[PDB]
Design a protein around this ligand. Sequence first.
Ligand code: HEC
Ligand code: HEC
Lengths: 112, 112
Amino acid sequence: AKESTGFKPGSAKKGATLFKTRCQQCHTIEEGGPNKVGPNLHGIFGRHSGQVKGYSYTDANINKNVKWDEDSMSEYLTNPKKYIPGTKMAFAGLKKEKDRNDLITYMTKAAK
Amino acid sequence: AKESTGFKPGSAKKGATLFKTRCQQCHTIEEGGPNKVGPNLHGIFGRHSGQVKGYSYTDANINKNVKWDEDSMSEYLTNPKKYIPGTKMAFAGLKKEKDRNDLITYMTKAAK
Ligand code: HEC
Ligand code: HEC
């Protein structure tokens, strides 16, 4: 629910730091970075869920076929399991809206 | 409602022809095409509503701030006025789902 989301741009600075303290443990975002616990996120926005080559996803994520946009990412980050029952991503999610906007700001930039 | 949409790839061939008999009257999709009744659509997918330079949009579309994805485009095409009360785009919309998938297929390709 994109509209619902109505995602607003935030602090890319801020996003940068939430990435490190929260997604870096398991993911890279750099162009040409490798998979790790989670898959490399470079190019995420221009792609559906479950397609980075050489990464083994759950049927759940593959089947989910999400077209990752910022409204999409926003739901998913509040509760990944909730957005994708069966996913193996282990993280409670980002509950504050502000948090998610900052992050997605960075992501949107870093991942391009 | 992307999920709802669950947009499936269709016939780009088919999409090509529905573009001509239906959107070409008012739009171009080619990279570097000009505005006309409607704005040039090249790059649509990577953009929000109301940002092609030199085109005069209604406050309605500007204000709508749509992040054009394929799920987005799908709602909009069933009833643009419905998706954007106030818009000046004059077209009843594409009622059959099949129609919309074909079109969006092309669009997604042509507009890149
Ligand atoms: C390790 C404990 C993780 C942390 C911290 C974060 N994520 Fe993750 N991510 C992890 C796994 C195991 C998986 C795959 C799940 C599966 O079921 O296959 C993922 C997947 C993602 C995805 C989907 C990618 C796709 O190509 O479909 C996204 C968009 C994602 N992860 C983003 C993300 C962000 C932004 C994080 C920080 C808040 C984050 N994840 C944390 C494991 C882990
Ligand atoms: C002329 C009678 C039109 C035809 C046929 C189609 N569209 Fe159109 N389009 C038209 C106008 C006057 C406008 C702007 C409306 C406003 O309120 O400003 C538009 C706008 C669009 C948009 C939004 C673009 C943006 O940058 O925000 C899209 C995505 C769009 N039109 C697509 C589209 C397609 C795919 C069509 C064929 C089925 C189509 N339109 C028909 C005018 C006219």
